[PDB]
Design a binder for these strands. Structure first.
Ligand SMILES: [Mg+2]
Ligand SMILES: [Mg+2]
Ligand SMILES: [Mg+2]
Lengths: 101, 75, 51, 49, 55, 50, 155, 87, 226, 141, 180, 143, 89, 295, 34
RNA sequence: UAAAUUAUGGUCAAUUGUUAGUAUUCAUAUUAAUUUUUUUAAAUGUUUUAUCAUUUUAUAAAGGUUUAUUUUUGAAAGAUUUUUUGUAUAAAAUUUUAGGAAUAGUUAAUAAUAAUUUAUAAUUUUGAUUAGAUUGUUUUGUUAAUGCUAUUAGAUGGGUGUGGAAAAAUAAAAAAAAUAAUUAAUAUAUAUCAAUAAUAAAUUAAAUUAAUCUAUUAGUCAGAAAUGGAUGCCAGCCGUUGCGGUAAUUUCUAUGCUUUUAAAUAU
């Protein structure tokens, strides 16, 4: 799904909706978690072939500790925004140096 | 400290490793310094260089040293 | 946040003969008792709970 | 239009130092944390579907 | 991106214009630094002012 | 100001403290001396001289 | 002193509010209240300090805090050249005047005398342009002859 | 006063603990005898801690939860926590 | 009723007669510090936080407060606090600027004494009159740069020696021979010849790899045997 | 001699020299000559705690003749207000009047020395009388 | 002027503006209830002290016997008292100079005190709201009408300067002969 | 009389010896230079440089080569620009177009308090770690 | 709020509010009668507002005059004391 | 060595109390710590301690915990309700008898001393322009002519100097509004504060005297100030140059001179000479002549 | 002296306070104290 | 280098823990607070209009900041009218950690320049920069007192940038363009604050409207009060010194006693 999303964004940024539609069809057929439901009909049925983005991507190891503690504290409410005082009392270290970078 | 280690704590990666400076072509400004834990002035005199007298520049030692003995006793 | 009266409430749900009462009532010199979570009867040859 | 549902109380107050109730506000959609969380932990061994 | 979003050198407001015409009626566009260049930089030295009759 | 109680209660001052008592009949009148003094922290007067 | 004196909530042991008005102009907090980002967590600072302790006006002559020797006055004495000692003859901390002070006068140097000093020597300028109760308080006193005459016996 | 004795209390005078083990310990001489010591376990801030305490509570039933209080000083060399009195 | 005892409190809704109605914030809370790091592995590299650290800007103990009764306020009638400052210009390397070191004063009521704290400022000057050593007077003004909001008003003391040295072409003041230490570890002078440069480099790299090995920890009493 | 050592003052050393001479039963004491020390000696002589004093016009020191009564000394204790010259203590008129008020009874037994803004070394009795507050120097009784 | 309006406590013309006199009081047991007449902006934040132009004074809505006064046989003077402490100078300054606004409860309190006429809210159900007719109003206007000069003089006295200087004061103030 | 160390010299303690020795201000300024142009007008608030330019004086210290080069380079700016814009308007117009579109495509085109903050990282520190990444240190200057 | 009668014009629109802002001519006439009573109270209110402003201005004038007199006396005394002290110095 | 130090004897309680003359509580009571936060809650709070700062009678509407509605609470007032010095101490009597009798003997405004409040020259110009604009007009159509004199008095009490421009504006506004007594009061304020009028101010006051019809005022004005006025001689310089050097302080006059001498607020008496620089005495002569004719 | 501040022993708190002592404050005469 | 007086003035400073050779503020008291005997919800439909729209409705908790948070009168108040006058983004000081070293789209000049100008740049051992902790300079508690010990809610990036001002995505004790209401203060469900609650703890009664309601006082060696039985360094007790070896004033238990009184216990 990560490379599918990156390729789809690159296609829509380079203005190739035909290739974007082909990628969407492939993803829908395969069953990728992100693109299981997203399926669209073919509109190019009669013609043959021939700063911008604001996002941040870092490897897993950067926030693996945050992920681990989030799932340890609240594994039943994934959308909880684990914060201070949930795992450490006042005037005490929270354990993880550099929360949210 | 950004080049070595992320925040610290890991032993051996808090203090910068040993830095060697060529006095003829200094790569730092104000080589000598005064600090409670960084007194390097005493480590730039005669007596510390006897350990590496087998490979050193006697001309540079003469040019820049402290309490240098007489040339006869040096020879 | 600390619950402390739970033991007092639980005391009412222990219907029967409690370990202390049975341990006090028994009056046999050949039956010895110990306690890890409650009073249990110890078998001499096994060195464990007399099942 | 199934809008008859009442406002959720999924956020639950937890007691903190001076009994000030801390509320776990749900994360906003415009962040990468949930995107990273939804992916499998071990891509090599965990199923991708 | 090189420095501050609004440099101090560019926060110039002109009082020679009417108060309410710069916001909506028009926008004055000029390089105001040239007239505020100091006498030390521009080499100007204040000579004694002569009266009109003697000038 | 309680430190200026004498000046506030003195009628010979144009800046004296002002009071209004609206009776149930609808007319307003000046407060009595007791009512005027009631708006200050109470103090005990005593003299052991005699 | 006692514990009750530490309760600044009382209006008896607290500096009055009008000091800030006297310092920054009459009716100055009306503008400050209208500030949008006020009280979160800060408001405009209030200069509520006793008039006899203001550092802007007072000096070593009539202020105790300006007579501190080792830091308030020792540096000044060193700068100005006055011979200074801890148990000095003068209150500030200088044993004697400096050479410049001794040699040169300072009466007519720095500023001409303000013309308003004539109020203390001429009684002719003492004016009260309006009566004491000219703003409608003429009837404040109920037993004054003025009020009695203006009202009448029936009133 | 000693403030490092109540390390495992973590401020609160009452610590809600579970029950895992109960053994006997000999108090410091010359006070000879056997005293019942409770090895108990609790969890605090998703961290499990185990401690040895004095089993002052008299047994009248089977219990899996206990309340740890600071208590006083005891002749037992190392334990510093008492069990809450039975109510 | 703060002055009333605990058992004397019949009610707590209002003050019946007068006084100060103050919240009874509980100071005796027994705050606890939880050790979350190894003794020699605290994440910070300079300052270690091993206990409850007192928080506050002015409420900390011992009490420290600003002291407006100093030399600058004794000399000047400042319209605003800290408007005017007298200091010596130290450092003239940026064009049309003059770095001035002015010392304010902080008072400790507990000890009932004051100390002076030195602060540096960037003072703007035209025609480049401020030379090293001048005793100058500076005042606040409009913002000029990111860190320039003071300007010189008068040069109380001219540095005649510095001006004469500049006229002769030499620097206004010889550079100091001692500076900030680049690193905590001492800096050893390198005197090796060209032939011995590689050997000295090898020795230095061996020392560095030994310092890296120090990360492993204490050497075991029993040597590793398989 | 060192930073940690207290910054001694002429008032402090004058007080300690007088106290030591009193404890050792001496007649004449040579004490440093400053305006504040001379004022303190004059006030003590006025109150009778000291038999007499003389300011020989020597820049360093002057002489004080002590007094004793019934074998013991008429001076019970002398203590300077501040040990360090860095710290300076100011005495408010209410803090001075609290000395006179002894649980409801007027008391002028213990003597306190203050120097006012007029360079006039007086005692707390006169300071209270004229309602002025100066910096304190010593307590003697 | 908000994407999501705070529907619980809306106001008019935004913030901050139009200082208004209200009666703030914490919701406590009624026997310990006491309000505070105070002038504040139209919009207030969580704590009322942020927007507080001036403080008018306390009001205790509890009828109390006059224990301070001696026990008098006067029937009207022995009725229950409802004490209210108010400020006059600040109230006049904010009402006239700054043209503030007032709420119904402070208006009723000030009407009781005599500072203001009775508020529009308080009305007697016995007397209905009357109606008007132009012809009858004109007939009354013709029946009685004040002189223009005297009406201008009274308007000037009420609105513009009223403390005038007469000829006696002018003669007293005029310079004396030596400097003439 | 070389300064002992840079750490002490920066805080202005090397020249503090003259202050402490009682010779803080004793130079007979009138003889060494004209004192009329070395002060400032309190009534107007204009600085010593303004007083000197009003009186026609110039108290300029001797200058090294680098500052003279800087002054010449900054002075030549208007003369170079006036002829460059006339002779080669193509590149100037291209740069003007780029700046015109850059003012639209930027951060905080409105001059609010956030954008007006002269020291943005120092003023807004709480968002310097998790919200922004452009700055690594919360302060960069003496203030 | 603004009262909306039940007998008003019904907006025959489903895409908006069910009632219009217009009104019956009787409603307009009766509104004028009610608005006439609003003007009776506010005119006295406005007049009382102006007279209070006048009273405050006059009191400020008199009190400020007295304060200016006293302050000028005090500052003249202070300046005379300062010049006497300067002569003694 | 590991033990701490112990005193040989106690420290004198009087000395210990006397050394506390500059404690933090004393500093707070003197008001040295400047306030920037909100402090305690004032209005509309459970602990809002504002309505208790002004005197009020005891509340006895109903049972307040001691059945105050039917109980003689003399002892209750003495032991609970009246504030104490501390827990268990004697009740703190805040009554008027505790305050000194000398508080009542002082005259009005004699407590306030003289203040030297100086500001930046830009701030002075801004304040002068704002006050001039307010004197000219304070509101759209509600500007009473009395408001001009009100703003003049506010400028006075704010420790400002009403320059000749301010005096001209105020006198002209009041004369145009037809209230000449107010203009006479402005002139009397100028006389009281010893602002020497310039020729333009003299002309404005003479216009006020002309419209009022009082010649004695012009008699006084001519005797006080117009005596030195002279016409322009053919040999004299007509456009006289600026003569008053702007205020400045040298090193000695900055270091040794006292603060009150160094302080400088814009005083119209300094620039009256520069405002009399154009020799407009003919207007003054004409106004005096027409004053005499009116009289 | 609160027990949680600085170390368990009181001399830790006293040593921590001694670094803020006005007489020992960092200056030219006393520098690099730590 | 002189005394005082036309006599208490100018308005209260006051410290209470039965120890245990000595050294050193460290066990047990009092006050304040937490703790047991079940006190103690943050409400769901804001409104008007010219109708698929427009007009009015601007700081709640989320994100961890110690050289740091600072600004408007263009809306409103606001008035015969037109018209006019002014601003303001900037500062200064106080800034935490047991074992302490480097920091960085970076300083200044120039300008509506420079991703690529010029310069011997700037921060810091007078403790910087990252990291940890904590919502900053009117709040408490204790004391005779220079101290010590507390305090709160809210300013966490932009990206068609509306608006006077972003504070703009549930959270009222805010009547918001017609007098809706003034006999109103009373307030029935889901997370939280003090309306949270302190009520003559046992003998002559409630000038009323009769409306809400139970818990063992703990000890008995030293030190208020203990005898008999059982145990015999065992079981146990313990603020403390310690007690239990066959007469135990310290355990268990019968009975009896004690209490300045409403608990006990801990932090
Ligand atoms: Mg602890
Ligand atoms: Mg941080
Ligand atoms: Mg025995």
């Amino acid at each position: 799904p990560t490379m599918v999303k990156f390729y789809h964004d690159c296609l829509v940024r380079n203005n190739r909706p035909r290739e974007a539609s082909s990628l969407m069809r492939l993803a829908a057929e395969r069953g990728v978690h992100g693109y299981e439901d997203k399926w669209e009909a073919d509109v190019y049925k009669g013609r043959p072939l021939d700063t911008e983005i604001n996002s941040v991507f870092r490897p897993r190891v950067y926030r693996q500790l945050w992920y681990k503690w989030q799932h340890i504290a609240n594994r039943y409410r994934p959308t909880a925004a684990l914060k201070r005082r949930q795992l450490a009392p006042r005037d005490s270290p929270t354990g993880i140096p550099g929360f949210y970078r | 400290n950004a080049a070595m280690g992320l925040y610290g704590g890991e032993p051996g990666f808090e203090k910068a490793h040993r830095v060697w400076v060529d006095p003829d072509r200094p790569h730092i400004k104000h080589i000598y310094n005064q600090t409670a834990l960084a007194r390097n002035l005493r480590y730039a005199r005669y007596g510390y260089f006897k350990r590496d007298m087998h490979l050193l520049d006697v001309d540079k030692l003469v040019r820049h040293a402290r309490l240098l003995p007489t040339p006869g006793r040096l020879l | 946040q600390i619950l402390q009266k739970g033991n007092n409430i639980l005391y009412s749900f222990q219907w029967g003969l409690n370990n202390g009462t049975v341990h006090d009532l028994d009056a046999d010199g050949g039956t010895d008792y110990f306690m890890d979570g409650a009073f249990h009867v110890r078998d001499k040859e096994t060195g464990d709970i007399d099942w | 239009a199934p809008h008859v549902l009442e406002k959720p109380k999924r956020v639950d107050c937890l007691r903190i130092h001076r009994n000030r109730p801390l509320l776990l506000h749900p994360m906003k959609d415009n962040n990468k944390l949930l995107e990273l969380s939804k992916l499998p932990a071990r891509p090599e061994f965990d199923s991708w579907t | 991106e090189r420095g501050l979003y609004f440099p101090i050198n560019h926060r110039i407001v002109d009082h020679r214009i009417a108060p309410g015409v710069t916001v909506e009626e028009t926008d004055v566009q000029s390089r105001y630094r040239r007239e505020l260049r100091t006498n030390f930089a521009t080499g100007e030295t204040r000579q004694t002012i002569a009266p009109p009759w003697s000038a | 100001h309680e430190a200026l109680k004498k000046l506030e209660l003195d009628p010979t001052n144009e800046k004296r403290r002002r009071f209004v008592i609206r009776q149930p009949d609808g007319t307003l009148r000046s407060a009595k001396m007791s009512e005027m003094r009631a708006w200050y922290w109470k103090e005990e007067w005593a003299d052991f001289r005699f | 002193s006692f514990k009750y004196a530490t309760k600044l909530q009382h209006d008896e042991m607290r500096q009055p509010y009008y000091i800030h008005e006297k310092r920054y102009g009459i009716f100055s907090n009306e503008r400050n209240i209208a500030k949008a980002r006020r009280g979160l967590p800060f408001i405009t600072p209030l200069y509520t300090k006793h008039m006899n302790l203001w550092d802007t006006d007072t000096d070593a002559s009539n202020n105790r805090f300006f007579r501190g020797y080792y830091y308030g006055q020792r540096e000044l004495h060193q700068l100005l050249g006055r011979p200074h000692s801890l148990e000095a003859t003068n209150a500030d901390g200088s044993n004697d005047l400096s050479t410049y002070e001794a040699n040169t006068s300072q009466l007519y140097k720095g500023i001409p005398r303000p013309a308003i000093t004539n109020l203390h020597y001429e009684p002719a300028w003492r004016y009260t342009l309006y009566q004491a109760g000219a703003h409608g308080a003429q009837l404040s006193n109920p037993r004054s002859p003025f009020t009695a005459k203006v009202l009448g016996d029936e009133l | 006063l000693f403030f490092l004795r109540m390390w495992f209390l973590y401020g609160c005078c009452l610590r809600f603990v579970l029950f895992v083990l109960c053994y006997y310990m000999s108090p410091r001489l010359p006070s000879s005898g056997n005293r019942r010591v409770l090895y108990a376990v609790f969890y605090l801030y998703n961290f499990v801690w185990m401690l040895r305490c004095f089993f002052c509570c008299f047994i009248g039933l089977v219990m899996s939860l206990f309340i740890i209080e600071g208590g006083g000083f005891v002749d037992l060399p190392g334990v510093k926590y008492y069990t809450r009195i039975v109510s | 009723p703060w002055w009333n005892f605990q058992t004397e409190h019949r009610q707590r809704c209002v003050l019946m007669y007068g006084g100060a109605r103050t919240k009874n914030t509980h100071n005796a809370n027994h705050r606890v510090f939880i050790k979350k790091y190894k003794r020699n592995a605290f994440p910070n590299r300079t300052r270690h936080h091993w206990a409850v650290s007192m928080t506050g800007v002015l409420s900390q103990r011992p009490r420290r407060m600003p002291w407006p009764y100093d030399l600058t306020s004794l000399i000047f009638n400042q319209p605003r606090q800290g408007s005017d400052k007298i200091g010596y210009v130290v450092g003239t390397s940026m064009l049309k600027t003059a770095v001035v070191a002015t010392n304010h004063m902080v008072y400790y009521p507990k000890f009932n004494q004051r100390v002076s704290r030195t602060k540096r400022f960037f003072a703007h000057d035209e025609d480049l009159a401020c030379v090293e050593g001048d005793l100058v007077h500076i005042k606040q003004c409009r913002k000029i740069s990111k860190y320039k909001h003071y300007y010189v008003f008068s040069i109380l003391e001219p540095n005649v020696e510095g001006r004469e040295r500049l006229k002769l072409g030499l620097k206004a003041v010889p550079p100091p021979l001692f500076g900030y230490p680049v690193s905590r570890r001492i800096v050893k002078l390198n005197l090796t010849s060209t032939e011995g440069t590689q050997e000295k480099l090898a020795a230095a790299i061996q020392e560095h790899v030994q310092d890296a090995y120090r990360f492993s920890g204490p050497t075991p009493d029993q040597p590793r045997n398989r | 001699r060192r930073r940690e050592e207290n910054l001694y003052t002429p008032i402090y050393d004058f007080c300690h020299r007088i106290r030591e001479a009193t404890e050792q039963r001496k007649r004449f004491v040579v004490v440093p000559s400053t305006i504040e020390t001379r004022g303190c000696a004059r006030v003590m002589h006025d109150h009778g705690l000291v038999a007499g004093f003389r300011d020989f016009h020597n820049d360093r020191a002057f002489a004080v003749e002590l007094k004793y009564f019934q074998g013991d000394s008429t001076i019970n204790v002398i203590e300077p207000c501040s040990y360090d010259g860095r710290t300076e203590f100011e005495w408010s008129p209410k803090m001075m009047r609290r000395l006179l008020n002894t649980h409801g009874i007027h008391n002028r037994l213990v003597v306190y020395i203050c120097r006012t803004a007029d360079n006039r070394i007086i005692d707390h009795i006169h300071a209270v009388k004229e309602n002025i507050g100066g910096r304190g120097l010593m307590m003697v009784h | 002027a908000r994407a999501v309006i705070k529907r619980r406590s809306p106001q008019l013309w935004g913030a901050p503006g139009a200082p208004i006199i209200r009666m703030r009081g914490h919701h406590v047991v009624w026997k310990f209830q006491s309000y505070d007449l105070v002038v504040e902006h139209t919009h207030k934040r969580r704590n009322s002290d942020i927007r507080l132009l001036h403080y008018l004074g306390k009001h205790c809505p509890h009828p109390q016997k006059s224990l301070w006064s001696p026990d008098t046989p006067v029937a009207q003077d022995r009725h229950l008292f409802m004490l209210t402490t108010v400020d006059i100078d600040a109230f006049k300054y904010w009402f006239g100079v700054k043209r503030c606004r007032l709420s119904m409860k402070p208006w009723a309190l000030l009407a009781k005190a005599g500072l203001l006429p009775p508020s529009l809210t308080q009305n007697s159900k016995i007397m209905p709201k009357p109606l008007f007719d132009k012809e009858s109003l004109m007939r009354y206007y013709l029946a009685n009408r004040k002189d223009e000069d005297v009406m201008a003089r009274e308007k000037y006295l009420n609105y513009e300067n009223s403390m005038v200087k007469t000829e006696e004061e002018r003669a007293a103030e005029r310079p004396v002969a030596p400097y003439l | 009389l070389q300064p002992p160390n840079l750490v002490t010299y920066r805080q202005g303690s090397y020249w503090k010896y003259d202050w402490n020795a009682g010779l803080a201000i004793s130079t007979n300024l009138a003889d060494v230079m004209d004192p009329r142009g070395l002060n400032g007008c309190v009534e107007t608030g204009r600085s010593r440089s303004e007083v000197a330019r009003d009186l026609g004086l110039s108290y300029t210290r001797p200058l090294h080569e680098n500052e003279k080069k800087q002054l010449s380079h900054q002075a030549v700016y208007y003369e170079r620009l006036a002829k460059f814009k006339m002779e080669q308007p193509e590149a100037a117009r291209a740069m003007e177009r780029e700046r015109f579109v850059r003012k639209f495509s930027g951060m905080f085109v409105k001059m609010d308090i956030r954008s007006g903050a002269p020291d943005f990282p120092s003023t807004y520190r709480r968002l310097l770690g998790t919200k922004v990444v452009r700055w690594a240190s919360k302060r960069h200057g003496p203030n | 709020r603004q009262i909306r009668p039940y007998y008003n014009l019904p907006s025959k629109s489903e895409h908006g509010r069910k009632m219009t802002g217009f009104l019956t001519p009787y409603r307009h006439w009766m509104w004028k009668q009610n608005e006439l009573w609003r003007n009776v109270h506010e005119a006295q209110f406005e007049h009382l507002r102006r007279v209070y402003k006048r009273q405050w201005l006059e009191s400020f004038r008199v009190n400020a005059d007295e304060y200016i007199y006293k302050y000028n006396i005090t500052k003249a005394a202070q300046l005379a004391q300062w010049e006497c002290e300067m002569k003694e110095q | 060595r590991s033990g701490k130090a112990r005193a040989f004897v106690f420290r004198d309680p009087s000395l210990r109390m006397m050394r506390a003359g500059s404690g933090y509580q004393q500093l707070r009571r003197m008001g040295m710590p400047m306030q920037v936060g909100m402090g305690w809650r004032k209005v509309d709070s459970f602990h809002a301690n504002t309505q208790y700062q002004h005197a009020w009678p005891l509340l006895s509407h109903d049972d307040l915990g001691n059945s105050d509605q039917s109980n003689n609470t003399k002892n209750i007032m003495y032991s609970m309700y009246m504030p104490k010095r501390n827990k268990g101490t004697a009740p703190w009597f805040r009554g008027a008898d505790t305050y000194s009798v000398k508080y009542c003997e002082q005259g009005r405004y004699e407590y306030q001393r003289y203040l030297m409040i100086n500001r930046f020259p830009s701030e002075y110009k801004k304040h002068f322009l704002s006050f001039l604009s307010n004197i000219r007009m304070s509101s759209g159509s509600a500007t009473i002519p009395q408001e001009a004199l009100h703003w003049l008095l506010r400028m006075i009490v704010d420790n400002f100097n009403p320059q000749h421009v301010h005096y001209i504006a105020a006198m002209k506004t009041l004369q145009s509004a037809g209230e000449l007594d107010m203009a006479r009061d402005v002139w009397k304020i100028m006389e009281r504060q010893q602002t020497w009028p310039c020729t333009a101010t003299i002309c404005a006051y003479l216009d006020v005297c002309v419209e009022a019809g009082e010649k004695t005022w012009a008699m006084e004005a001519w005797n006080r100030y117009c005596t030195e006025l002279k016409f322009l001689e053919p040999g004299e310089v007509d456009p006289k140059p600026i003569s008053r050097v702007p205020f400045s302080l040298t090193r000695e006059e900055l270091l040794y001179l006292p603060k009150w001498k160094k302080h400088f607020d814009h005083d119209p008496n300094l620039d009256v000479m520069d405002l009399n620089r154009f020799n407009r005495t003919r207007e003054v002569y004409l106004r005096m002549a027409q004053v005499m004719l009116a009289g | 002296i609160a027990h949680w501040y600085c170390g368990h022993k009181f001399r830790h708190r006293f040593m921590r306070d001694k670094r803020f002592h006005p007489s020992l404050q960092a200056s030219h005469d006393a520098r690099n104290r730590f």
